[PDB]
C-alpha cells in the first residue's frame, strides 16, 4: 500500500517463474487434460464419485496452470500497455484492459500452434488495448469505425506533413483518404476533445473558464415581462370582440390551451359546422385586422 499504485502492482507481480518451452507445453497439456476432465464432468451421464473427484482435481490443476501462465505474462501485457500510454487513458487502466485481453488470449491458445505464447498473445493484447482505448478514452464516445477513420487520416496527414514539409491542402488530403472533402471536414471536426471549465482563466485566481460563459436557459426577465404584457393586451383585445368570436379565435390559436384546434375541431364543443366555424374565424381575422385593434399589437410583433 503506497502512492503511485502502479509500483505496488509491479511489486505484486513479484518474482514468478518464467516459462521455457517444455514447461509451457506441459502446462498447456495439463490445461487440455483439465478441459476434458470438466467436459466429462459436465455430461449428465452418471460417473463414479471417485473418478469425478479425480477429474475435478485435474481441472483444478489446469486452472492453477492457467493462473501460472497469466502471472507469467503480466510482464508482457504491461509492456504492451506502456506501448500505448499517454493517449488519455490512465496507464494502470490500460494495463487492466490488456489483462482482460490476455485472459481472452489464454482462453484461445493451445500448443497445436508451433509458436510461443509471446507471439500469439501480443495480437490479442493489442486488440483489447486498442478497442478499449477507442471506446473509453474520449469524453464524447466515438464509434470504433470513426476512431479508425480519424486516426488513419491523422497518421497519413502527419506523413504528408513529413514529406511535403508543409500543411497539406484539404483537396490533397481528400484524394489521399480517397473520400470527399466533406467527409474530411466532418471527421476533422469530430476528432476534437473538450476543454475543462475549471481551468485558470488567465489571471492569478480570477475564477475559472466556467465563470465567464453565459447560459441560454436563463429566462431573460425583459422577455418574460414583455411576453406577459403581450398576453394581457391580446386577451383584452379578444375581450373587445364578441364572446363567440373571441372564443372561436382563441380555440383556433390555442390561447387557453397550448394546442390550437382545427376549424372542424372547434365545431364539436361549440356546435357549429366546419365551414360555419371557418367563416366566423375568417370574420374574426378580418375584424382584428382593422386598424382599430392593431395599433397596440403592432408594437409587440
Amino acid at each position: 500500500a503506497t502512492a503511485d499504485p502502479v509500483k505496488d502492482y509491479l511489486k505484486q507481480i513479484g518474482k514468478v517463474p518464467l516459462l521455457n518451452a517444455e514447461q509451457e507445453v506441459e502446462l498447456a497439456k495439463r490445461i487440455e487434460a483439465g478441459l476434458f476432465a470438466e467436459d466429462k464432468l459436465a455430461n449428465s451421464d452418471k460417473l463414479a464419485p471417485k473418478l469425478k473427484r479425480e477429474l475435478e482435481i485435474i481441472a483444478e490443476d489446469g486452472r492453477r496452470a492457467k493462473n501460472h501462465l497469466l502471472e507469467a505474462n503480466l510482464r508482457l501485457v504491461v509492456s504492451l500497455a506502456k506501448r500505448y500510454t499517454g493517449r488519455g487513458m490512465l496507464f494502470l487502466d490500460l494495463i487492466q484492459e490488456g489483462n482482460l485481453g490476455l485472459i481472452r488470449a489464454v482462453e484461445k491458445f493451445d500448443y497445436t500452434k508451433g509458436y510461443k505464447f509471446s507471439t500469439y498473445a501480443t495480437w490479442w493484447i493489442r486488440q483489447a488495448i486498442t478497442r478499449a482505448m477507442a471506446d473509453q478514452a474520449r469524453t464524447i464516445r466515438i464509434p470504433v469505425h470513426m476512431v479508425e477513420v480519424i486516426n488513419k487520416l491523422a497518421r497519413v496527414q502527419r506523413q504528408m506533413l513529413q514529406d511535403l514539409g508543409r500543411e497539406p491542402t484539404p483537396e490533397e488530403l481528400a484524394k489521399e483518404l480517397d473520400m470527399t472533402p466533406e467527409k474530411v471536414i466532418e471527421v476533422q471536426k469530430y476528432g476534437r476533445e473538450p476543454i475543462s471549465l475549471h481551468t485558470p482563466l488567465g489571471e492569478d485566481g480570477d475564477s475559472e473558464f466556467g465563470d465567464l460563459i453565459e447560459d441560454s436557459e436563463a429566462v431573460v426577465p425583459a422577455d418574460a415581462v414583455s411576453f406577459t404584457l403581450l398576453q394581457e393586451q391580446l386577451h383584452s383585445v379578444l375581450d373587445t370582440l364578441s364572446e363567440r368570436e373571441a372564443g372561436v379565435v382563441s380555440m383556433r390559436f390555442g390561447l387557453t390551451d397550448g394546442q390550437p384546434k382545427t376549424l372542424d375541431e372547434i365545431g364539436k364543443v361549440y356546435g357549429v359546422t366546419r365551414e360555419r366555424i371557418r367563416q366566423i374565424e375568417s370574420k374574426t381575422m378580418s375584424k382584428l385586422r382593422h386598424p382599430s385593434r392593431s395599433q397596440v399589437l403592432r408594437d409587440y410583433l
Binding site: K189, Y190, I195
Partner: protein, 1259 residues
Amino acid sequence: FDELRIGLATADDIRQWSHGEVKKPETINYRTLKPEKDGLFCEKIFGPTRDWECYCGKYKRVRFKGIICERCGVEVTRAKVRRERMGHIELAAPVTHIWYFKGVPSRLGYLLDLAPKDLEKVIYFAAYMITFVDEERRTRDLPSLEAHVSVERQQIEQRRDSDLEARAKKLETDLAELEAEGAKADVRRKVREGAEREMKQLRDRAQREIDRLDEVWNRFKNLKVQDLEGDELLYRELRDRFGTYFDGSMGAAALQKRLESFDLDEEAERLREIIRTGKGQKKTRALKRLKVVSAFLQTSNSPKGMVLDCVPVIPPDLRPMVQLDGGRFATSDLNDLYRRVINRNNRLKRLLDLGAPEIIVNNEKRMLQEAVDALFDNGRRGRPVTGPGNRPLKSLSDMLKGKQGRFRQNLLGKRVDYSARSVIVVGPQLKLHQCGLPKAMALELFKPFVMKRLVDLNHAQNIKSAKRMVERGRTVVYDVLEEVIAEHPVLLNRAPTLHRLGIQAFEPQLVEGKAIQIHPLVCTAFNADFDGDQMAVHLPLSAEAQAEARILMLSSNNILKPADGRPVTMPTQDMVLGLFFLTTDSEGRSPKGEGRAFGSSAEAIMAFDAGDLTLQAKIDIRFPVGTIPPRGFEPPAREEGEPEWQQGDTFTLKTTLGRALFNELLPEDYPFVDYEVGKKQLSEIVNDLAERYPKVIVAATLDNLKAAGFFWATRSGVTVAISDIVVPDAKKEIVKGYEGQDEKVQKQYERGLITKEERTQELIAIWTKATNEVAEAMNDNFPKTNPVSMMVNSGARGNMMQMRQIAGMRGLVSNAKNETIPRPIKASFREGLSVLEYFISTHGARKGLADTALRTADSGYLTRRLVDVSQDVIIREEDCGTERGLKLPIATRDADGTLRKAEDVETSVYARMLAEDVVIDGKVIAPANVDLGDVLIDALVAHGVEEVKTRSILTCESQVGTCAMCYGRSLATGKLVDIGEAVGIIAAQSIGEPGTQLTMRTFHTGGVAGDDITQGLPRVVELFEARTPKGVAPISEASGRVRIEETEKTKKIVVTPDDGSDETAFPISKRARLLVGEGDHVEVGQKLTVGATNPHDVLRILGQRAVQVHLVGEVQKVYNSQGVSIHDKHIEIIIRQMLRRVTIIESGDAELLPGELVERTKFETENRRVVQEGGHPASGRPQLMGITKASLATESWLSAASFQETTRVLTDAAINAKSDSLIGLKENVIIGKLIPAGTGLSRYRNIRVEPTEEAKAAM
C-alpha cells in the same frame, strides 16, 4: 427552515434519492449531440434536455405534460428538473469513504482499534483481516487437533530417521565401492565428501520444513479477530492447513463485515472501565475512542455508513457538458471522474462474471477504490488524478472548500443585478447626502422604473416601445430619468469596505460626464482618494430596502466613526487649511488696520474689501442680540450700576474678522469660538455639534464649513517654490564640525585603537545627535507664515519629520535585512541626494512597500477571523438582571496635593453605564445608569474619587445574549445602543480597520534573536489566538524564597513557596537576564524574568479578571504605540468570547468526558442538574483559547463550515448527527432568510399598521 439535520447517508437512502441507475459511461452521441441512454446525462433518469420534450420524437408539446412515453421513458416536464434529479451507481464491490478515513483520528475515531497503517494496508489490498473466528470451536476440539499434530510430528521424525539411515547406507556403500575400485588415489574420500554434503543439504530442508510446520501451528494458536496477515502466502497456508474456523477477507468488504458485526456497546463499557483505571497517553487514546464510539451509540444511524455501497451522481445540469461555438466543448471534471468510476465498476463486473484470478480481481477492486477516492477527494493520497496532466482534476470536496469553494464564493459573497461601477471625481457643490451618477449609468440602473414612467406618461405607446425608446436614448427618456431617480437612495460602496461606513446611502443626481461625483467630506470615510479610484453603486429595490437606505445608511446620519466615537466626516486636506488660515493670530501678514473697532461685522467686511483691514488683525467687533458669547466671556460683562445679562445681548469683543466669519458659519445658538481652529479643535467643535444639535443642523453646519474652507484655502495662497523651502544656513557649518569629529574617529580607528563595532556604534550615536540638532535648528529657522508651516501645523496634511527630510538631511537609513549604515545621508531632497545615497534610500523604500503589502494581507485575514468569531453576539434584552460591575481607574498619576485624571480615560470609561451610584460627601454625585461625558467626569475628578464601578459586558448576566445597558451607549450614534444592533460585527470591524495603519516594526534586531518580543500586527494576532508568546517569562506560583542555580549546562531558578508548600523548580535560558534577587522573598503575581506573560497561566492562578485586564491593556498599548485608538468595549466583547468555554475536570458524577472544552452555560446547566439529582458537581476550570478554536467549536456546524476549515468540521458534524439550529447570523445569510439582528427581529417585524379614527373622519 428550522434545522439542517446532517448525517451519514446509508445505501438505502442513496437508493431512495436516485430516480434510476447509471450503467454506462456514455455521455452524448458524437453526431446528434443528444444524451445517450442510461449513461450520464440520460433523460430517462435525470430529465428532459428541452422543456417538456422527450427523446424519441413522440409526445412533444406543453399540453400533455406529466406523462411518461413508453418509447424512451423520458418524463415530460420542465428542463429545470435536470438541476434537481440525481442518480446513483451500484458498485460490484463496496468501497470506503475517503473522508471518514485518511484523516485526523477525530473523524476516523478509532472505531476499530487499528492503527492508520493497518487500514491503509488493508483497504488498498495489501493484507488480510480475520473478520471472525470460532475460537470457542477451536478450543473445544483442542485435544483432537493436538493429537493429530503429535502424530504428524511422530511420522515426520520416523520418515526423517529412515532418510538418515538411507543416507548413511548410501555414504558407506559409495565409499566402500570406490575404495575397492581404486580408479585414482583417493576416489573414496571425494565421494564421501559429496555424500556428507548431500546429507547436510537434506538436513537443511528438514529443518526448513520443521520450521514451517512450527510457524503455522503457532499462528493457529495465535488466532484472534482483527488480526492482520501481511504475508499472502502465510494466509494461504492458514486457509489450507485449517478451514471452517477462521473467516478472512481483504479490502473494504472486510471492513463492512467487521462494522456489521461490531458491538460498540461492549467497547464503550470496557473503555469506561479503562478510563476509570488508566494512565499515560493510553488514557487520551481511550478518551478519543469513547468520544467517537459514544457519538455513534447515541445517534440512531448505524456505523456501516462508513463503507458506502452506492455512489450518488450529481445532477447533470450542475456538471454541464455545455455546447460551445466552434464545434468545441466544455466539460467539468466531475464528468471525467464519474466516467472513471463507471468504467472501473463495469470492468470489475465483467471480471467477476467470468472465472478470473484473485490477483486481477483484487487489483481491480483497488482500482475502483482509488477511483471513488479521487471522485470524493482527489489528491488526498499520493499524487492526484491529474487528468489532462496540466492541472489536478477538480473533485466533489474541492468545490466545497477553499477561497474558490462554494461556501465563501457563492453563498456569502454573491454577484448582484442592478448595480454599476465607475471612477470617482470630487464634487464640492453637492450637499452631504447627494452623489452624482453619469447619465448612462443612471439610465441603465433604472431601466424598469424608466420604462414604467414612460408608459404611464404616454411618451411610449407600450412596454416594448418603451424598451426601444430607452435603448435609443431620446431626450424624453432623460427627462423621465431626471423625474424618477429623485427620492430613491443608492448605496455607494468601495471595494475594501473596512468598516460599516464603507456602504453609504445617497440621493442620486444626474450629471454630465462619465464619473461618479462625490462629496469631499465623506471621502475620508471611504478612505477613497482621487488619484484614481472606482466605487460601486448598488440599488435598494424593495420598499423595506429603500426605507433602510433612507433611515439607517444615510450619509448624513453617520457623522461619528464607530471605532471610538469621534467625527470622521470632517476631512482636513484642504478645508482645514482654509479655516486655519481664517482663524489665525497676527503676524500672518503685515497686520494693517490693527487697533480699531467696527460697528458690526458687515462694516468690518466692507473695510476688508477696501483693503485697509486685513483678515488677520485684532479689532473690537460688536454682535447683534442673540449672539451667544465665548464660554469664557460669560463672567466678564459690561460695566453698569444696573443688572445686565450679556449671555444673550449685545457685547463688543476683541477678536478678528476671521473668527467672526467662522462663528457665523456655525449656528447662532452655538457659543462663540475665539481660538485658532487647526484640526484638533475643529474635531472638538464638530463633536460638540453632533452631541448637542439635531442631525440636519449638523449637516448644514458641515456644508457651510466646507464652503468657507475651500474659499479661504483658495485665498490662502499656499504654494510651493524653490525659494519656499529654505535650507537652514547653520546646517553646513554644524555638519562639517561633525565630519571633523567623524574623520578624527576614523583616524584613530586606522591605528587599531578602537574595534570596528565600537566605531560603528559611536558613529551611529554621533549622527543621531547631529540629525536631532539639525532638526531642531530647521524647526527654529522656518517662519510661521510659509505654506509648509501653515499646512503642517494646521493638521491639513504632512508631518514634521517629512519637512525635516525635505529641508534637513535625511539621517540614518536602514540597511538591508535591518541594519544601520555607518554613513547617513547628509543631503535633503531639496539639494538632491547623491547616487549611492539614493540607492541606500531605495533599500528602505522597497522594503517599506513589501512590508505594507504583507501587513494589509494579514490585516484582512485578522479582520475575517475576528468577524467570524464575534458573530452571534446581538443585543437581545433591554436591561440586565444583575448589579455586579467592573472596577476602573478614573484618575491616576495624581501629583502631590492634586488630582489628575487618567491620560487615556476616553477609551476606558467613557460611554459606559455606572452599575451603582456614588456618594463621597454623603450626597449622590453621579446617578446610576447614566453614560459618562466631560461634565460628569470633571465633577467626579474634582470631588476626588479615585475609582469607579462601571457596568460592562463582561459582568453582564443576561439569559439571552447581552443586555443593552451593559454594552452602554453606541459610539456611531451617541445614544443608548438600540436592541438588536450587531455589536459583534462592529467590534470586529473596529478592531480590524487600523490593521493596515499599524505598520510598526522593530527598527533593528540589535544582533540578538529571541530577546525583543513580537511587535505590531503579529503581536495583536498572537494575543487574539491565545498563542504562547515568543518571549515567555514564567510567573511566580505563590510567595516564598527564590534563588538561582547557575548550572554549567543551563541556568535554573528554584523557588520554595512559603508555608511549607511544595518546592517548584522553573527552567530558564542561560542568558536569563532576570531581576529578582537570589534567596529572596517573592510574591504571587510578579514575573520571574523579562518577557511577555503567558495568558494561560495568568488565567490559571490570578483569575479571569486578571487575564481580561491583561489582554485589554496589552492590545490597547500595541494599538496606541502607532497612535490609533479604539474603545475598550470592542476588545471586551471578543475577550468574553474567548473565555466562554471551560475545561471539565473530575468528570465523575457529571458522567461526561474529563478534560474537554464545554460551554459555560452548558456547564452551569449540567451542574444544576447533577446537584438537584444529589450527585456532587463535576469540577471545571476556565480555559482561554484563540478565536479560531472558539469559532470552530461552535454549535452551528453550518457557520463553522462557512469558516476556513470545511472538511473536518463537516465530517464531525455528519458523524455527530447534529442539527444546525438557525439561530445566529452567518448561517441565516447562507439560507437567504432574514438575519436576526436589527430589522430582522421578531418584535420589530410583527407590528401592524392602521390610521386613527379621526384621520378617517377628516378624510
